[PDB]
């Protein structure tokens, strides 16, 4: 459902694992190119924990497929992101979400 | 400035720079243009690249009239030239465009029938070349937003094209992609039968398939050989280019051919499923023109260029970040600097009312709506709006109010609600509180001290949209308060020590625009209680140096202020007196 | 007229209706602000009593009936065909005067707006009509600002209708003001109205103007102007190199911009065309420029991903080589000496071509122009020539700003007029006929 | 300016006389400034009379009489603390039978043709309270039960005696000095 | 010569502004003179503040803070218009307030905070919205009346505070008379709790409110319940369901502490 292409390479041996929080510093954009979310704007690295349904699916699988220190472009189809109901006031219904995500560190 | 000419203006920002002011003009009484101004004057210049704008009602050569669609005739836009038939009439290629674009599919695919008409994404418009207008002089098709090419003579060969060929490792062309800003056809070559178009019609039909991206043209019921394949997500504008040889030249028709959705459905999202052709007032004819102004930025990038060596070569270096606000017009797919809204009045007023609408939707503790608006108006945009000097006053006030409403308003209101009632816990610090800081009876600086009274807790949710937790929508969105505090103090100091000079150009254009938003944000921060100790000391020095000096220049009180700023300072003095009363209550409890 | 009696048989008092409407609009006129306060109070009392008496006599319903029986005819031409030419001329003015009279009658009167709350649903049904849009919006604004009861009457369908009016009729700020009145009235916020207006207007991002902070981007070019024309002494293959000595991916919130490639002037003028002199535009943002960012090929503000060994965004210690072949229009790039599986081809060749790099802040890059000015770390492909050869014998090669204006003192800034065309850029010896 | 603000607020059209802490406080302040309250000799009696005249002049030169009349008229016959403060201010400015203030009030009333002033006066005098044997008996029975009183004054009987005295003293001051024209006009 | 204090500085700057310029803004003039009077009447600030002042030991800091947050939510929700989510918010906040121990421990703090005024303001809004067409959001009125009855039962002075508003409750005495299981949740029950078991309040009861209650009971005797006949009960002339509750209120008014108030 989610396809990943690397913007910058990472170490390639350290990967997300069960019960480990992923510190990602991301920028979210719609498929047409309009920004809707960015952790760089808030200057706060985003922390979420795998396997506990804290974030959207496509984001979770993209982060899992990423490696430590790797910057990659994440494309999330509507099924793995907000479905057809969408996010009220931010994400239009049936919208494809593009994410520029960097896995800074894993505690 | 003519061809190959270089000149300089000196507005007298520095009087010494003016070469001959002392020799002539100083004794007479003339003043330098920028003698009192504290900022360099924004300089405007003619725009080289033409941009499409609506035909003015008083345009002397080209006139556009709208024919309402009847029961049997589709809605139609007719272009006619009033200047023709008389001297001074202009005979030149005139570029015309419809205002709104048709959007292609984001991802391309691998009696009219109602089902096919409903499911199809194909759109159609036609133009009728009037009798007596040379078809060779008229070109019909689609143009993108990038079409900024204006020339006396236009040829279909000149259109700017590029082919991006992507290959595999072996080098095989897995995709070859043609890109052009112009996709148009010529009626002169379109006409097969010959001269006999002035009999009737010469309707040139443009057919666009949004799902596939295929552009096909029909002429008098036959499919023309010309066909264009456009990239996904391309925005195509209906456009007709014509050199007028007749008073009546071409006519946009918004009709629908068999099994094809009309243009209005593609243009308007609301009418996406409406088969009836429509010409809503938003749609209008736009023509290319050179009558526009460009704004030279006040500050440019620090770029340093030098030859390092024979070995190393030329080096170009830029290490300081410069950033600006861009306002993007959705329908025209063009972005302009918001500082141009100083001279674009209509967009300025609309954006001010849009900011007021944002404030209204997020007003009175609508935390979910505030979180939603955090996406549209972001933290960097808000901070740049707060700090930039050249922004219009209306947008400045709107952005200040929007920041307050999104982040500070809820907690400020809660603390104002708790201001009246005092609940003082019985603690060691409470017992330690005293009326006077020292033995000699001198009032401490108001707001500085130890306060033990129970007060609302400050809690902020972190805006984030990848997260799916619903706890974030409860509580106000989070804003960096230390940065806001420092910037508020710094800009308040600048405004105070500039206002005494009484500059001709205050920030925002007026003293009210300069002070009311700043003092409002400052008052909101003071109500919230973000200010602590030395920051509040600097605040009191700014408000009045002599009275609040801890144991000449005139403070914010003694500076001949306007009435709204006077009201704001009245509110501030109210809050300071309330702080004094609260300190008295705490000391009473301590003695008790 | 509806029952189709003959035009002369029916009496239609057009002129008297128009004059009486004008007199009634003047009769229900708010006091001017410059008047003395007590006189303003007297005039306000008189206006309020006037409105109360009119509402008790039921004038509002009669005005509404007139409005409806005029609305039954769609257009002025239609009404002229039904009744007569003068009636068709006066139809629009009479409708506007009636709507203005309704607004004046109900404006500022809590009771009148309370009774109009019930009939307001009928009013919104004609919002889409061009002839009545402004008057209906004015009446709606008055009713909403005065009576919270009508605010309760307002529903999701009506909110969608107002937003659809914003879509169809363009950007009108009175619509936004009506929406603000819907959101907040008398210091009381309607959460349902706020949520609906948000969830409908905002996520589309199609009507309200959208704002972003964009990094400033500048272009950096040498003096060389490279053009190919029939019967001209210009070599058609060229090559230069650029290395990223240092780069910072994120100096600001936005990503650092760095694109390298060739650009073409418009015509023979030295001034680069197709792009604004200042802004976020860079190489590949217009159809006159051709750029490579390390992952995509940029042309016409459209990017397509290109494959390359160890493909990555341009970073420190990356040597970028750009090849221009004008015999057959071709632009090819090679990253770190390895070929990039992509090209630009079949582009316009009318204008002169020059190397250019576009960048935001936080970079440090160096031109390797070949020969004396720079050295090529990777050997140029066979048939290509270093760019330093294109320099004219008299002139010297610098790297200068592509655009005219740079940062400097405001008075020392040189304002430049239009520049002459570079006729000497391309040398074409034309035969003299003998 | 303060007097003009109060006059404009009174002249403003509204169903109630909205309670204004600012009006009540400043009216009390100005009334106390006016009155400023062992056999006195004639010299010092005329002293005190001139001093009171100057103190009253400081206000009625600026529109205090018009303030009082407008506030009483806008009261619309409802007793309140605002009406009591206005009556006290009128008493302060009219104390001693001030002919100038009486003339200004009469001229203002005649020229405005204010029926509201007299309608409100009639309403206030109708709504003025009197002794109540029922309330007295209830209070006595509470005392006999011995329950602790909530208010030591026991103001339930003769609810507003100070207000009643102020209103009738205002009328007496208005008619003081055998002001025959105002006596007939009432 | 320096003012050297905020009071003197404010007095000087207000008087100076006023004498410098004629000020067209009524709000500015009002705020200026309010500030001047505040500076001159320093005692009045303490006079107003001390009743609002309350003292709590360190043990109750946390639950006092939680109760203050709940009261702040209830107050902030006054500005917002009534709705379903708002109804849920009111109910949850009032439940938290009644659950917290400080509500029982410190009635004087609670009167000083004035929740009774806020809760009755909420109820006033609810009843004024659609009073003729039956009170929309009946759960609102039920919860508010239950909270006010508990507030009455908390302390004797709370019966003072609720009886101060007895006139409005008896005006809207017919809110939820007909509906069963609403007993104990009607403004009539709020009035009954206000006047219950208090000889002083029974004596302070006036005649006109008793006349109004008697008129309501007479109307109940004269006419049947339209809501009941709408549900389909047989239409007998008089209305026992609404008559009984009025009779109970009259009983509480007349009889107190085992002895009949003879007046």
From Swiss-Prot, chain A:
It catalyses: [protein]-peptidylproline (omega=180) = [protein]-peptidylproline (omega=0). Signal peptide: none annotated. Inhibited by both FK506 and rapamycin. The keyword Ion transport does not apply. Its main location: cytoplasm. GO terms for molecular function: calcium channel inhibitor activity; calcium channel regulator activity; FK506 binding; peptidyl-prolyl cis-trans isomerase activity; signaling receptor binding; transmembrane transporter binding. Residues 19-107 form the PPIase FKBP-type domain. It is found in: Cytoplasm; Sarcoplasmic reticulum. Gene3D superfamilies: 3.10.50.40. One of its GO terms (cellular component) is sarcoplasmic reticulum membrane. GO terms for biological process: 'de novo' protein folding; calcium-mediated signaling; insulin secretion involved in cellular response to glucose stimulus; negative regulation of calcium-mediated signaling; negative regulation of heart rate; negative regulation of insulin secretion involved in cellular response to glucose stimulus; negative regulation of release of sequestered calcium ion into cytosol; neuronal action potential propagation. SUPFAM superfamilies: FKBP-like. It comes from the Eukaryota. InterPro entries: FKBP-type_PPIase, PPIase_dom_sf, PPIase_FKBP_dom. Detected in heart muscle (at protein level). Isoform 1 and isoform 2 are ubiquitous with highest levels in brain and thymus. The keyword Cytoplasm applies. Keywords: Cytoplasm, Isomerase, Rotamase, Sarcoplasmic reticulum. PANTHER family: PEPTIDYL-PROLYL CIS-TRANS ISOMERASE, PEPTIDYL-PROLYL CIS-TRANS ISOMERASE FKBP1B. Has the potential to contribute to the immunosuppressive and toxic effects of FK506 and rapamycin. PPIases accelerate the folding of proteins. It catalyzes the cis-trans isomerization of proline imidic peptide bonds in oligopeptides. Identified in a complex composed of RYR2, FKBP1B, PKA catalytic subunit, PRKAR2A, AKAP6, and the protein phosphatases PP2A and PP1. Interacts directly with RYR2. Belongs to the FKBP-type PPIase family. FKBP1 subfamily. This is Peptidyl-prolyl cis-trans isomerase FKBP1B. It comes from Homo sapiens (Human).
Curated annotation (Swiss-Prot), chain B:
Detected in heart muscle (at protein level). Heart muscle, brain (cerebellum and hippocampus) and placenta. It is found in: Sarcoplasmic reticulum membrane. Induction: By TGFB1. Channel activity is modulated by phosphorylation. Phosphorylation is increased in failing heart, leading to calcium leaks and increased cytoplasmic Ca(2+) levels. Residues 111-259 form the B30.2/SPRY domain. The calcium release channel activity resides in the C-terminal region while the remaining part of the protein resides in the cytoplasm. Cytosolic calcium-activated calcium channel that mediates the release of Ca(2+) from the sarcoplasmic reticulum into the cytosol and thereby plays a key role in triggering cardiac muscle contraction. Aberrant channel activation can lead to cardiac arrhythmia. In cardiac myocytes, calcium release is triggered by increased Ca(2+) cytosolic levels due to activation of the L-type calcium channel CACNA1C. The calcium channel activity is modulated by formation of heterotetramers with RYR3. Required for cellular calcium ion homeostasis. Required for embryonic heart development. Belongs to the ryanodine receptor (TC 1.A.3.1) family. RYR2 subfamily. Homotetramer. Can also form heterotetramers with RYR1 and RYR3. Interacts with FKBP1A and FKBP1B; these interactions may stabilize the channel in its closed state and prevent Ca(2+) leaks. Interacts with CALM and S100A1; these interactions regulate channel activity. Identified in a complex composed of RYR2, FKBP1B, PKA catalytic subunit, PRKAR2A, AKAP6, and the protein phosphatases PP2A and PP1. Interacts directly with FKBP1B, PKA, PP1 and PP2A. Interacts with SELENON. In cardiac muscles, identified in a complex, composed of FSD2, CMYA5 and RYR2. It comes from Homo sapiens. The gene is RYR2.
From Swiss-Prot, chain D:
Channel activity is modulated by phosphorylation. Phosphorylation is increased in failing heart, leading to calcium leaks and increased cytoplasmic Ca(2+) levels. Induction: By TGFB1. Detected in heart muscle (at protein level). Heart muscle, brain (cerebellum and hippocampus) and placenta. Changing residue 102 to L: In VACRDS; decreased function in release of sequestered calcium ion into cytosol by sarcoplasmic reticulum; changed ryanodine-sensitive calcium-release channel activity; mutant channels are less responsive to activation by caffeine and store calcium overload; affects channel sensitivity to cytosolic and luminal calcium activation. It is found in: Sarcoplasmic reticulum membrane. It is linked to Ventricular tachycardia, catecholaminergic polymorphic, 1, with or without atrial dysfunction and/or dilated cardiomyopathy: An arrhythmogenic disorder characterized by stress-induced, bidirectional ventricular tachycardia that may degenerate into cardiac arrest and cause sudden death. Patients present with recurrent syncope, seizures, or sudden death after physical activity or emotional stress. CPVT1 inheritance is autosomal dominant. Homotetramer. Can also form heterotetramers with RYR1 and RYR3. Interacts with FKBP1A and FKBP1B; these interactions may stabilize the channel in its closed state and prevent Ca(2+) leaks. Interacts with CALM and S100A1; these interactions regulate channel activity. Identified in a complex composed of RYR2, FKBP1B, PKA catalytic subunit, PRKAR2A, AKAP6, and the protein phosphatases PP2A and PP1. Interacts directly with FKBP1B, PKA, PP1 and PP2A. Interacts with SELENON. In cardiac muscles, identified in a complex, composed of FSD2, CMYA5 and RYR2. This is Ryanodine receptor 2.
């Amino acid at each position: 459902g989610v396809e990943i292409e690397t913007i910058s390479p990472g170490d390639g041996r350290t990967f997300p694992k069960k019960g480990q929080t992923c510190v990602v510093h991301y920028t979210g954009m719609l498929q047409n190119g309009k920004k809707f979310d960015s952790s760089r704007d808030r200057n706060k690295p985003f922390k979420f924990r795998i396997g506990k349904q804290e974030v959207i699916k496509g984001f979770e699988e993209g982060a899992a497929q990423m490696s430590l220190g790797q910057r990659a472009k994440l494309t999330c189809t509507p099924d793995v992101a907000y479905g057809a109901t969408g996010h009220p006031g931010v994400i239009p219904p049936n919208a494809t979400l593009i994410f520029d995500v960097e896995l800074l560190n894993l505690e | 400035l003519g061809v190959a000419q270089v000149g300089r203006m000196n507005f007298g920002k520095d009087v010494s720079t003016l070469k001959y002011f002392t020799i002539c003009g100083l004794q007479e009484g003339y003043e330098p243009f920028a003698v009192n101004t504290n900022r360099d004057i924004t300089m405007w210049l003619s725009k080289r690249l033409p941009q499409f704008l609506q035909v003015p009602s008083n345009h002397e050569h080209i006139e556009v009239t709208r024919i309402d669609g009847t029961i049997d005739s589709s809605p139609c836009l007719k272009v006619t030239q009033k200047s023709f038939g008389s001297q001074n009439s202009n005979t030149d290629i005139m570029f015309y465009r419809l205002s709104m674009p048709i959007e292609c599919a984001e991802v391309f695919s691998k009696r009219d029938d109602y089902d096919f008409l409903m499911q199809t994404s194909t759109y159609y418009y036609s133009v009728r070349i009037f009798p007596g207008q040379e078809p060779a002089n008229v070109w019909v098709g689609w143009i993108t937003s990038d079409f900024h090419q204006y020339d006396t003579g236009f040829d279909l060969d000149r259109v700017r094209t590029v082919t991006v060929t992507l290959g595999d490792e072996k080098g095989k062309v897995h995709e070859s992609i043609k890109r052009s800003n112009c996709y148009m056809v010529c009626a002169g070559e379109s006409m097969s039968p010959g001269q006999g178009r002035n009999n009737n019609g010469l309707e040139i039909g443009c057919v666009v398939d949004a799902a596939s991206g295929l552009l096909t043209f029909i002429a008098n019921g036959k499919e023309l050989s010309t066909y264009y394949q456009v990239e996904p997500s391309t925005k195509l504008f209906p456009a007709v280019f014509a050199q007028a040889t007749s008073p009546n030249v071409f006519q946009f028709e918004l009709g629908r051919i068999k099994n094809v959705m009309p243009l209005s459905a593609g243009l308007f999202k609301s009418e996406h499923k409406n088969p009836v052709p429509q010409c809503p007032p938003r749609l209008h004819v736009q023509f290319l023109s050179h009558v526009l102004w460009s704004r030279m930025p006040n500050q440019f990038l620090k770029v340093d260029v030098s030859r390092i060596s024979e070995r190393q070569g030329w080096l170009v270096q830029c290490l300081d970040p410069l950033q600006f606000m861009s306002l993007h017009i959705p329908e025209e797919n063009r972005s302009v600097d918001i500082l141009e809204l100083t001279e674009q009045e209509e967009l300025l007023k609309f954006h001010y009312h849009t900011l007021r609408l944002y404030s209204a939707v997020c007003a009175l503790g609508n935390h979910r709506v505030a979180h939603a608006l955090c996406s549209h108006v972001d933290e960097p945009q808000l901070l740049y709006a707060i700090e930039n000097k050249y922004m219009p006053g209306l947008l400045r006030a709107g952005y200040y109010d929007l920041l307050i409403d999104i982040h500070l308003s809820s907690y400020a209101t809660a603390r104002l609600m708790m201001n009246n009632e005092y609940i003082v816990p019985m603690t060691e610090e409470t017992k330690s509180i005293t009326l006077f800081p020292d033995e000699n009876k001198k009032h401490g600086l108001p707001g500085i001290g130890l306060s033990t009274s129970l007060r609302p807790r400050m809690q902020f949710s972190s805006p984030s949209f990848v997260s799916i937790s619903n706890e974030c929508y409860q509580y106000s969105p989070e804003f960096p308060l230390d940065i806001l505090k420092s910037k508020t103090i710094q800009m308040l100091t600048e405004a105070v020590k500039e206002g005494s000079l009484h500059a001709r150009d205050p920030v925002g254009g007026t003293t009210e625009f300069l002070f009311v938003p700043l003092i409002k944000l400052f008052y909101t921060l003071l109500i919230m209680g973000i200010f602590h100790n030395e920051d509040l000391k600097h605040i009191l020095q700014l408000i009045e140096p002599s009275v609040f000096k801890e144991a000449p220049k005139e403070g914010l009180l003694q500076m001949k202020l306007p009435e709204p700023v006077k009201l704001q300072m009245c509110l501030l003095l109210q809050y300071l007196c309330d702080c004094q009363v609260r300190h008295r209550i705490e000391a009473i409890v301590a003695f008790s | 007229l509806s029952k189709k009696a003959k035009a002369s048989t029916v009496d239609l008092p057009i002129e008297s209706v128009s004059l009486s409407l004008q007199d009634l609009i003047g009769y229900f006129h708010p006091p001017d602000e410059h008047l003395e306060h007590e006189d303003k109070q007297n005039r306000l009392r008189a206006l309020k009593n006037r409105q109360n008496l009119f509402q008790e006599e039921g004038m509002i319903n009669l005005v509404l009936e007139c409005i409806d029986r005029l609305h039954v005819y769609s257009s002025a031409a239609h009404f002229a065909d039904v009744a007569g030419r003068e009636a068709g001329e006066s139809w629009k003015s009479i409708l506007n005067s009636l709507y203005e009279l309704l607004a004046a009658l109900i404006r500022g009167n809590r009771k009148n707006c309370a009774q109009f709350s019930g009939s307001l649903d009928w009013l919104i049904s004609r919002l889409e009509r061009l002839e009545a849009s402004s008057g209906i919006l004015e009446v709606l604004h008055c009713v909403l600002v005065e009576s919270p009861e009508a605010l309760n009457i307002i529903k999701e369908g009506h909110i969608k209708s107002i937003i659809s009016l914003l879509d169809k009729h363009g950007r009108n700020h009175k619509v936004l003001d009506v929406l603000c009145s819907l959101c907040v009235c008398h210091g009381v916020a309607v959460r349902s109205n706020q949520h609906l207006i948000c969830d409908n207007l905002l996520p589309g991002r199609d009507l309200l103007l959208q704002t972003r902070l964009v990094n400033h981007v500048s272009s950096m070019r040498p003096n060389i102007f490279l053009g190919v024309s029939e019967g001209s002494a210009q070599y058609k293959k060229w090559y230069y190199e650029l290395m990223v000595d240092h780069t910072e991916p994120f100096v600001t919130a936005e990503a650092t911009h760095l694109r390298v490639g060739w650009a073409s002037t418009e015509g023979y003028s030295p001034y680069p065309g197709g792009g604004e002199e200042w802004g976020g535009n860079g190489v590949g943002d217009d159809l006159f420029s051709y750029g490579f960012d390390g992952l995509h090929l940029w042309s016409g503000c459209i990017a397509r991903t290109v494959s390359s060994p160890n493909q990555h965004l341009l970073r420190t210690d990356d040597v970028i080589s750009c090849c221009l072949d004008l015999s057959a229009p071709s632009i090819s790039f090679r990253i770190n000496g390895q070929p990039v599986q992509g090209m630009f081809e079949n582009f316009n060749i009318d204008g002169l071509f020059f190397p250019v790099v576009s960048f935001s802040a936080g970079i440090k890059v160096r031109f390797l122009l070949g020969g004396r000015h720079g050295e090529f770390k990777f050997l140029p492909p066979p048939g290509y020539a270093p760019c330093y050869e294109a320099v004219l014998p008299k002139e010297k090669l610098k790297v200068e700003h592509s655009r005219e204006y740079k940062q400097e003192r405001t008075y020392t800034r040189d304002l430049l007029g239009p520049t002459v065309s570079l006729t000497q850029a391309a040398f074409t010896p034309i035969p003299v006929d003998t | 300016q303060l007097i003009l603000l109060f006059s404009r607020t009174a002249l403003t059209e509204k169903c109630k006389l909205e309670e204004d802490f600012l009006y009540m406080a400043y009216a009390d302040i100005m009334a106390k400034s006016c009155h400023d309250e062992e056999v006195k000799s004639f010299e010092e009696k005329e002293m005190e009379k001139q001093k009171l005249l100057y103190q009253q002049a400081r206000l009625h030169d600026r529109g205090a009489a018009e303030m009082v009349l407008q506030t009483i008229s806008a009261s619309k016959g409802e007793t309140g603390p605002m009406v009591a403060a206005t009556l006290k201010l009128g008493i302060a400015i009219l104390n001693g039978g001030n002919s100038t203030v009486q003339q200004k009030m009469l001229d203002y009333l005649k020229e405005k043709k204010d029926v509201g002033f007299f309608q409100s006066l009639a309403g206030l005098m109708q709504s003025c309270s009197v002794l109540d044997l029922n309330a007295f008996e209830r209070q006595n029975k509470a005392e006999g039960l011995g329950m602790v009183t909530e208010e030591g004054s026991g103001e339930k009987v003769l609810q507003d005696d100070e207000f009643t005295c102020d209103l009738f003293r205002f009328l007496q001051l208005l008619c003081e000095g055998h002001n025959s024209d105002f006596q007939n006009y009432l | 010569k320096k003012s050297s204090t905020l009071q003197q500085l404010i007095s000087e700057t207000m008087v100076r502004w006023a004498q410098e310029s004629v000020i067209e803004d009524p709000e500015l003039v009002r705020a200026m003179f309010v500030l001047l009077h505040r500076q001159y009447d320093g005692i009045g600030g303490l006079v107003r503040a001390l009743p609002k002042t309350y003292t709590i030991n360190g043990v109750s800091v946390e639950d006092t803070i939680n109760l203050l947050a709940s009261l702040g939510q209830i107050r902030s929700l006054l500005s917002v218009r009534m709705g379903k989510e708002e109804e849920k918010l009111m109910i949850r906040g009032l439940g938290d307030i009644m659950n917290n121990k400080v509500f029982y421990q410190h009635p004087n703090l609670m009167r000083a905070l004035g929740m009774h005024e806020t809760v009755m303001e909420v109820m006033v809004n609810v009843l004024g919205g659609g009073e003729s067409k039956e009170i929309t959001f009946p759960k609102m009125v039920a919860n508010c009346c239950r909270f006010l009855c508990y507030f009455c039962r908390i302390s004797r002075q709370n019966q003072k505070a609720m009886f101060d508003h007895l006139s409005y409750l008896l005006e809207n005495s017919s809110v939820g008379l007909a509906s069963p299981a609403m007993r104990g949740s009607t403004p009539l029950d709020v009035a009954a709790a206000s006047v219950m078991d208090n000889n002083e309040l029974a004596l302070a009861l006036r005649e006109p409110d008793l006349e109004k209650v008697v008129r309501y009971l007479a109307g109940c005797g004269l006419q049947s319940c339209q809501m009941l006949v709408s549900k389909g009960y047989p239409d007998i002339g008089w209305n026992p369901v609404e008559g009984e509750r009025y009779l109970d209120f009259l009983r509480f008014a007349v009889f107190c502490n085992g002895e009949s108030v003879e007046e």
